[PDB]
Amino acid sequence: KETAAAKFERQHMDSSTSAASSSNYCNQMMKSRNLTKDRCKPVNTFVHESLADVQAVCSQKNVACKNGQTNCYQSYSTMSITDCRETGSSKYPNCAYKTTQANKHIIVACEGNPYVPVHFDASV
Ligand SMILES: Nc1ncnc2c1ncn2[C@@H]1O[C@H](COP(=O)(O)OP(=O)(O)OP(=O)(O)OP(=O)(O)OP(=O)(O)O)[C@@H](O)[C@H]1O
């Protein structure tokens, strides 16, 4: 039983590097975090900040979520992130991805007690 918070960390946290490594980053990262295993997850974002910094976003700027819920929060500071976007030549189980580095405000949905990130909603 993977908690929703643990799943968020597996899907979206990569504190080890400061920015996307190579053009290869998403191909390898989407694979190893088990985001390509039943299918190719079409789009995914990895956040290169400490877990404490990302968790803290749950007390930052409250904003509407894409699905209409009210539990989303935008970071006051920009954060180092990497966007992974499936290519057209990508066919499961050969998921291939374009790797885009950026520094952007992240928007996460938070839930629970303790109140922690459980969904990555957007970057702006
Ligand atoms: N405000 C919110 N609070 C809590 N959870 C919220 C939420 N908004 C959406 N979800 C949750 O995000 C997923 C939406 O699918 P999506 O972003 O459009 O991506 P998806 O097609 O990839 O479906 P998943 O693979 O389940 O994406 P994930 O939920 O696993 O990963 P993610 O939540 O960071 O996108 C569902 O589990 C939904 O309850």
DSSP readout, 36-102? SSSS--SEEEEE-S-HHHHHHGGGSEEE--TTS-S-EEE-SS-EEEEEEEE-SS-BTTB--EEEEEE
- Protein residue whose Cα sits closest to atom 8 of ligand 1: 67
Q: Give the pair of three-digit tokens for residue 14.
A: 């990569």
Q: How far apart are CA 46 and CA 81, in angstroms?
A: 6
- The reported resolution of this PDB entry, expressed in Å, is 1.6
What single-letter amino acid sits at 3?
Answer: T
Query: What CATH number is attached to the domain comprising 24?
Result: 3.10.130.10
Exactly one of 119, 120, 121, 123 is catalytic; name it: 119
Q: What is the DSSP letter of 30?
A: H
Q: Which of 73, 119, 123 to mutate to test the pocket of ligand 1 (most atoms within 8 A of CB)?
A: 119
Q: Is the CB of 118 under 6 A from ligand 1?
A: yes
User: By residue range, what is the domain housing residue 51?
Assistant: 1-124
Residue 57 assigned ligand-binding role: no
Number of domains in the chain: 1
- Protein residue whose Cα sits closest to atom 14 of ligand 1: 119
Are 111 and 94 contacting, i.e. CB atoms less than 8 angstroms apart?
A: no
- Protein residue whose Cα sits closest to atom 13 of ligand 1: 119
